[PDB]
Amino acid sequence: TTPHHISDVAIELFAAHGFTDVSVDDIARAAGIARRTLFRYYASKNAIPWGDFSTHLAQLQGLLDNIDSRIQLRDALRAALLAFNTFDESETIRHRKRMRVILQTPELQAYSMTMYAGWREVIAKFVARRSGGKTTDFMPQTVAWTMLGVALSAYEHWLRDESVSLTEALGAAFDVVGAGLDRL
Amino acid sequence: TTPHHISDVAIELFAAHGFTDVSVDDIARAAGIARRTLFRYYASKNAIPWGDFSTHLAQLQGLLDNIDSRIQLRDALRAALLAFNTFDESETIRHRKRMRVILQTPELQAYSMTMYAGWREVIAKFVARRSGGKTTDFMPQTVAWTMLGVALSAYEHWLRDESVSLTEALGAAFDVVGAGLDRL
Amino acid sequence: TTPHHISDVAIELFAAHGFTDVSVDDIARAAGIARRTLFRYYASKNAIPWGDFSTHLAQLQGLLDNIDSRIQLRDALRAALLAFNTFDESETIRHRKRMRVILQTPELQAYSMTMYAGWREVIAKFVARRSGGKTTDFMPQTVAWTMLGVALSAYEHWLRDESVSLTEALGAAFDVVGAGLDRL
Amino acid sequence: TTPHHISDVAIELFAAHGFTDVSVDDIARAAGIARRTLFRYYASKNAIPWGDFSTHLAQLQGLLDNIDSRIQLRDALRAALLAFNTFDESETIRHRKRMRVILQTPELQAYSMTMYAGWREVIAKFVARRSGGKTTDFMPQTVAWTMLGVALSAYEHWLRDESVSLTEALGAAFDVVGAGLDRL
Amino acid sequence: TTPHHISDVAIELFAAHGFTDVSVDDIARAAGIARRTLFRYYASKNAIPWGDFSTHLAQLQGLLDNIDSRIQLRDALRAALLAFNTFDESETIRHRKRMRVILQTPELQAYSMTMYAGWREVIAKFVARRSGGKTTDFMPQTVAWTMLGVALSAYEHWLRDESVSLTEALGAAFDVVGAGLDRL
Amino acid sequence: TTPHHISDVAIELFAAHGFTDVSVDDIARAAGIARRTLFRYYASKNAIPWGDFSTHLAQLQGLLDNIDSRIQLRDALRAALLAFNTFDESETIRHRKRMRVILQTPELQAYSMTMYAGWREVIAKFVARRSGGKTTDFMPQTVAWTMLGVALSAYEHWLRDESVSLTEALGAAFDVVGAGLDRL
Amino acid sequence: TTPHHISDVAIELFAAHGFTDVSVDDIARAAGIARRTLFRYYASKNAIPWGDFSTHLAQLQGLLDNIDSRIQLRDALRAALLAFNTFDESETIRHRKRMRVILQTPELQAYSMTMYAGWREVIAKFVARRSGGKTTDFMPQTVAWTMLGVALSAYEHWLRDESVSLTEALGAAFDVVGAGLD
Amino acid sequence: TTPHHISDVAIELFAAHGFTDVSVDDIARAAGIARRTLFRYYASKNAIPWGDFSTHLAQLQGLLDNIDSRIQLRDALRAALLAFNTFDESETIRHRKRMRVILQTPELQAYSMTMYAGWREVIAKFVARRSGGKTTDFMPQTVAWTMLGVALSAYEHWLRDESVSLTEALGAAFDVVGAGLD
Amino acid sequence: TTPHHISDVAIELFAAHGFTDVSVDDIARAAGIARRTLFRYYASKNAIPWGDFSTHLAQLQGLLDNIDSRIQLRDALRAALLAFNTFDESETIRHRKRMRVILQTPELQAYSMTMYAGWREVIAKFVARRSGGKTTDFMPQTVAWTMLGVALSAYEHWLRDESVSLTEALGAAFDVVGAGLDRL
Amino acid sequence: TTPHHISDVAIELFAAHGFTDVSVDDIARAAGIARRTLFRYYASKNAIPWGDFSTHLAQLQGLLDNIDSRIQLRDALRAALLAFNTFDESETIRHRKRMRVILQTPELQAYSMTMYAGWREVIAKFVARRSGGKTTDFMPQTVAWTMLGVALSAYEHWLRDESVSLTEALGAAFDVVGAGLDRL
């Protein structure tokens, strides 16, 4: 009905059963829509767990584009990383199920690589905007990949240990890389 | 009689014709083996571009085991990163083709994630051995992910621009993260 | 309930009145659609009994493409044959006891032979992909024809005797040929 | 041989011109008979490419009736298949033209299905005679259909190549299915 | 086993491909004979379009021997001319192709001259038998040449215009010369 | 030197030795010219005996074109036939050798047929000019062929019997056909 | 009464004891006949294991003579070879004992050579009948010898290895020669 | 002194008179030896026509053992078959008499069977050495039997028809089986 | 095998790129040697596709020396031809690439003629050794050249088809010339 | 004395100075012609030793085309081979004692192989025309190569020993191969 409603119901089904054992009609039925209605919002089954990531990416780009130019690069990246990954008690529970599906499902990895490249494109664009131009240059690209590593490290620590704050995990992972490998 | 021979032949075929249009028989035929003989070494077409990675990981462990304890953790990680991706003049051309297939083929990404997790496990073990113990701790884990991002950044820069040295690319990418984001 | 509904209604009138004295408009009228609406789903009267065979062929090819390469050729053929003949009592009635429009109508045999050639092309492609050179080589072609004979034998046994399971009929017919004529 | 003469003449005309552009009078004229005389041997145009066929089926029955009872069933089927499809260099040429017309002409397919059913009836009767059961049981029926598929595969291979022995093609095609799909 | 069969096959080939591009093996193969078997009946490719002309000349002699002596010389010549070129409905089409090859192919003209001389010898003998004796006398010789010219004129008119009867053409051409040039 | 000189010397050589055993250089040598000089006047060896027939045909056409319209067809043809074939004692001897070569040499017959068709074209044109139009109509064509038969009959009678006048032979042969076959 | 009953009885005795240690009277006694009655059916002890081979040869000739001419030569020979050697569980047991005594007894070899030459004559006659007709010609006779070797190879493999079907053994042995050493 | 000299002398006598009408003493006398001297080289009359076959078999084994492994099996067998049966005009004459006595004498057949089994053992060993190694296995032994039939077919054709080369006969007989009954 | 390794590597490069676009350093680099090290095994680029060849000729000499003297000359030549050209499925693949380079590359033809002369010298010596005479006599020389033509015919047939056994091709080609042109 | 004269003069200077250090102008100068006059007859330096081979090939094809079809294949090949190697003492000197530019010059071997392929194409076409399907089939191709080997063997024997007749050498070399290697 909303994209988000379809995604949420799909993630409940993927959490309970397999990803592989849940069909697109199972999702349509559980969401109370016709199958073709589902395809207006999602072109594929693999797209469904990645709910409205297009919008998340636009918002992250918006935040980074509008961050005051006097704010240092490191501070902007840490600020932006933690802003998009802060959640309420309710939305934290479904995000935990969603990330389990995304990170651990073999069939989602091809599609996920496209989503990660989108995210890295936003980060690299931001660095290119603050430095010399060209998203594909070494330094923007290294910063984007580094940031991706930080995030996935934090997400995995969070999933392994249910007592950890996601934003504390992200902050800690960021700080390793912020400080640098030359310092432990 | 080698996994390596099968892999080499398979990469030549995947480079020329694409991945999906190359059969497992095409590989067995080009390698001069029966189809079953191929399955002794590989349980899948998707496994084949990765060669004998189990042995590469054992030799990375060997290199890290034999680094002197007085050698600093950053130096050991940078030394191991660049050594693990140094190939004879013999093998530069085939490695370029191999990494194109691995990095760019959607069908390899599920399998690739397992291989990257293996590599990160070796790195994390080494860091835990030099710091407080526990492979799954946060930090000997952030370092492994960070180092993976550095590597993939270097590999992509290398593939995009043929006038880059791979070891220079890895060294440069490592040094961003080694120095830290706190220092531009 | 759009191409199917048209097909079901058509088979009713074809199974009611001579395929030759049922017109495309009679079918449109009985299905409650305009004449040109029917032509979006079917280019011809002869196409209507065959439903969406294009999709059945694509799905059979999809199943054979995606079968694990470690699975033997005989097992894959038997698996694929019996994977598309499972239907519910209702769907089975638009199929058994009653005879077949497809098998038994003289006017549809020329066209039906072209549809069977499509099916044999899927089978022969799969065999060629697992074993040898070209789709037109004798062995892929003999296997495709053998498979077609098995299928038509099973379909006729099923129509002749309404107490028999289609998938059991297919499995039994396959097993004669699997075991071989040298063991009768 | 009055029927055979008419058929031979008809097939030379069908080979040179269309099937559809050759009339029943064209056939009568080329055969040196009145139009009415042709109808004592053939009830329609579509019957003519099949020659006597009633007589070919009686001859196949005669050959199977006269095979020694001590000869095993597999050997008898292979022996009959290959003997029923043997000729001079001379009669091989007319048979190539005849089979092209039979296999490829849309208007002959309905009629051909009745001729194939006759042939399968002979084969199924023979199997029932050596094994017991009824002619309409699964195994005689599957063997008859299988043998038809073998034959059409052989015929198509033979037509597409023209360096190929028909009896070698039939023997090879039979042997795949004789050995069984459990082998190749 | 027939000269006629070889000739018929050869004429079909010469019509489709031209004379020079058809080999003696192409003829032996199409006729279903060994190459040496062809040379029993023909000592040359150039001989083949002329079939068993020796026998046609013996049968022309037979027809002229059996014409009643009371039948006038002109009537006998016209009767024999038209009978010698009358062919069954069976053979009109093949005779059209045969005469095209004979009349129009440069390579056949040397051989053809020998066959025309044979025919003229039969005619001249007959005229000498009805008049004063001596085959080589002037007049039973002029008549033979004149009759040959009449025939070839008729044949060419027949080939040029498919709506001409050959026997009407021969009869008309004969009648010019029969009536004489003294009468328009 | 002249075309006629080359032809005359060629005919002396063809008379003494074979046609087949005399080469084009033998002719060039005996005529006292270079080989390429011979090819300015003759495109082929086969053309050489037919010396300046192009000119003979133009002259025959000229004579027939200019013959008074009141002169009857028969008279014009007989007049023209005998005018072009009248010769002195010297030129009669070489014409006898030339016609022997032309009429009796197998290798000249293809080329000769083209020359005879040229001659017949002149005759038929003349008849078409006096009657209704179209050289290819039946009557002009029959008259041309008849005239050719007359001529060859006369030439052969002349060659067989050295005591005969060529113009008397032509006149006698003409008169058979002029009178008509209805009168002996 | 029957030569084959006498042969069957004789082969049971030859299987249990020696060939060499079984007398002609032992066989007469076991078969329920007088000694001279046995000699009306068999002129020698060496003849007895080859029971009514004369009849087997006539039957083989009959089968080969009556095979349809359109059936190819290799198919006819393979079909004929396997038809005479297809046996019930019961008849398989006595055939195994019979062939053991024939193939392994030195004293039977002279007589056996004459029986094999009879068999080869049937095969060569069949080939001569389908090709040019002289039974002593090269190909008729090469085919007969080859087929004899195929058969004896199959029989020996069959006796050596109790897991093997006789008709499978014959078919496999035939197929090596029918295919070719290539 | 030589076993083969004794055999050669014996075969000249067997060719001229019967096998059956030539005694062992007749052979001793013709060979210029005492009777017991003959028995040191041959334990039996039946052994004598098969002269020094033990040595022929060792030589055949030597030749087959030493054929290069890259040479295909059919070529090796055909090459070996024709090498042992290539003879000068002189040696052809005595070989013809030797094979006539061996192939046609009933009394030699028991002994001959043992010699043929020796020959087949050499062939089967060679095949086992190139393939999986057990000399009693099916294919080793089918090939040995087949090759025996080829050889005897060639020998008999050769004896029947004085216009035929032995090596041509063997090559032709080999080629039927090497090609196939197809 | 140092020479063979360099040659194998060189042929993979020559197959992928040109002959002309592959340098001696490219070969040294791919073989994992200094440029100077390559020159101890090969005196030029054109030598490299031929491998050791000196050693192949010594091996052919060894094989012919060790063929038993009682083996007839024809059998020894056929045996040597086929043994010298035998391989695994593996080494068949490299040999196909090698022979393409040897047979098709203009710059190798001069050098190839010297290699062919070496091969013919071995064959001619062997024939002289079995027959007497000198190596340079007509018959040894003709047999060596004939055998070279047989081989190149076989090699070309093998390259153009790829379903063909090299040893079958050689055996067939040998047998035409073994049997003689007096047959086929 | 125009393309020949150029060739003769060229061979003199080539047989005088290194083919490599004789230029196209030296040849034009020594022949007494302008440089561009030479290029009307020869497109290249490599063409000059080969004379007018285009014409030799056309003549060999002409001889084979026109050989009586009753003549056996072996006889036709031997006849054709020895029909073009007859020369006068003078023409033979521009051929024997002295060695060959064509056979012995390294720089002309690549080009010479293309000229030999032309010759083999003539031979193979002739064989295919007498016997089978395509020029590229094994037997026509083997016969052409065999024939080439025979020729080169004869040419070398002729050059090595100036007392030998070329046609006797060719005939002897042919006869080895005609008789066959099975009779050495």
Side-chain angles (χ1 to χ4, degrees), chain B residues 2-8 10-11 41-56 98-99 102 111 115:
Chain B
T2 59
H4 198 196
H5 173 49
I6 299 158
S7 192
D8 294 323
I11 285 294
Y41 303 108
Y42 299 104
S44 176
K45 196 167 107 193
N46 307 271
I48 292 167
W50 285 97
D52 190 14
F53 196 63
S54 84
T55 291
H56 288 79
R98 181 176 275 110
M99 291 296 116
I102 290 175
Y111 189 77
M115 298 298 107

Side-chain angles (χ1 to χ4, degrees), chain J residues 63-120:
Chain J
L63 187 155
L64 294 167
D65 289 344
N66 291 304
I67 201 140
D68 191 297
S69 87
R70 295 169 293 191
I71 297 168
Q72 293 177 335
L73 182 58
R74 130 104 172 67
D75 293 312
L77 292 172
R78 199 183 141 139
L81 186 64
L82 275 66
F84 292 104
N85 298 266
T86 281
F87 320 108
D88 184 1
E89 331 190 273
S90 64
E91 341 187 88
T92 311
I93 305 150
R94 293 182 183 174
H95 243 199
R96 218 199 327 110
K97 193 202 328 186
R98 191 153 296 258
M99 290 309 110
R100 208 53 236 165
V101 41
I102 291 177
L103 292 186
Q104 306 194 353
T105 308
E107 294 73 12
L108 226 58
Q109 298 303 300
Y111 178 58
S112 177
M113 284 180 91
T114 307
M115 300 300 257
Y116 300 143
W119 188 88
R120 290 195 310 279

Side-chain angles (χ1 to χ4, degrees), chain D residues 10 99 117:
Chain D
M99 291 298 114

Side-chain angles (χ1 to χ4, degrees), chain A residues 87-163:
Chain A
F87 302 102
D88 61 53
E89 300 159 296
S90 182
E91 191 171 51
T92 294
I93 297 154
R94 293 182 183 174
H95 195 60
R96 181 175 274 279
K97 275 174 283 216
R98 181 178 272 104
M99 291 300 115
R100 267 181 190 305
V101 162
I102 289 176
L103 293 177
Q104 305 176 178
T105 303
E107 295 75 11
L108 278 180
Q109 298 306 307
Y111 187 76
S112 296
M113 289 322 94
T114 304
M115 298 295 104
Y116 299 141
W119 191 90
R120 292 194 310 274
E121 194 181 352
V122 169
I123 301 308
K125 264 176 196 292
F126 170 64
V127 172
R129 181 177 65 83
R130 293 193 152 238
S131 316
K134 223 146 201 302
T135 285
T136 199
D137 292 342
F138 208 14
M139 161 64 180
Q141 277 300 314
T142 305
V143 175
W145 274 110
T146 293
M147 282 300 80
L148 184 56
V150 159
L152 293 175
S153 192
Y155 273 115
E156 286 193 323
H157 189 232
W158 180 61
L159 290 180
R160 279 210 79 77
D161 186 359
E162 72 287 1
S163 79

Side-chain angles (χ1 to χ4, degrees), chain G residues 74 77 106 109-110 113 120 136-139 141-143 145-150 152-154 156-157 160 169-170 172-174 176-182, chain H residues 74 77 106 109-110 113 120 136-139 141-143 145-150 152-154 156-157 160 169-170 172-174 176-182:
Chain G
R74 116 119 221 290
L77 289 173
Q109 298 307 311
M113 287 322 100
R120 293 191 276 95
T136 66
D137 291 346
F138 190 60
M139 163 100 184
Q141 212 63 42
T142 306
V143 168
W145 273 109
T146 293
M147 282 229 63
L148 182 59
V150 152
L152 293 178
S153 182
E156 287 193 325
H157 180 53
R160 174 161 291 287
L170 289 160
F174 186 93
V176 162
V177 136
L181 311 183
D182 322 76
Chain H
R74 116 119 221 290
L77 289 173
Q109 298 307 311
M113 287 322 100
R120 293 191 276 95
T136 66
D137 291 346
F138 190 60
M139 163 100 184
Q141 212 63 42
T142 306
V143 168
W145 273 109
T146 293
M147 282 229 63
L148 182 59
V150 152
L152 293 178
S153 182
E156 287 193 325
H157 180 53
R160 174 161 291 287
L170 289 160
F174 186 93
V176 162
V177 136
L181 311 183
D182 322 76

Side-chain angles (χ1 to χ4, degrees), chain J residues 156-172:
Chain J
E156 288 195 347
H157 186 232
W158 180 61
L159 290 177
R160 185 182 295 276
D161 184 0
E162 90 125 276
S163 80
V164 304
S165 168
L166 182 50
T167 55
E168 287 172 19
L170 288 160

Side-chain angles (χ1 to χ4, degrees), chain I residues 73-74 77 106 109-110 113 116 120 136-139 141-143 145-147 149-150 152-154 156-157 160 168-170 172-174 176-184, chain J residues 73-74 77 106-107 109-110 113 120 127 136-139 141-143 145-150 152-154 156-157 160 169 172-174 176-184:
Chain I
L73 173 60
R74 194 265 307 145
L77 291 171
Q109 301 306 309
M113 288 321 103
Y116 297 144
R120 293 190 314 266
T136 68
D137 295 350
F138 95 86
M139 176 178 73
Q141 211 58 41
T142 305
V143 170
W145 274 111
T146 291
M147 284 201 77
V150 150
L152 292 171
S153 191
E156 288 191 342
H157 191 236
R160 100 174 288 292
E168 286 184 359
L170 288 160
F174 185 94
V176 331
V177 86
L181 265 52
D182 294 355
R183 330 288 216 260
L184 295 174
Chain J
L73 182 58
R74 130 104 172 67
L77 292 172
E107 294 73 12
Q109 298 303 300
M113 284 180 91
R120 290 195 310 279
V127 173
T136 66
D137 294 348
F138 212 6
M139 193 275 307
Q141 207 68 21
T142 303
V143 179
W145 273 112
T146 295
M147 223 58 68
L148 182 58
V150 155
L152 294 174
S153 175
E156 288 195 347
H157 186 232
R160 185 182 295 276
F174 186 95
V176 165
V177 138
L181 299 186
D182 283 56
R183 287 156 214 70
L184 283 168

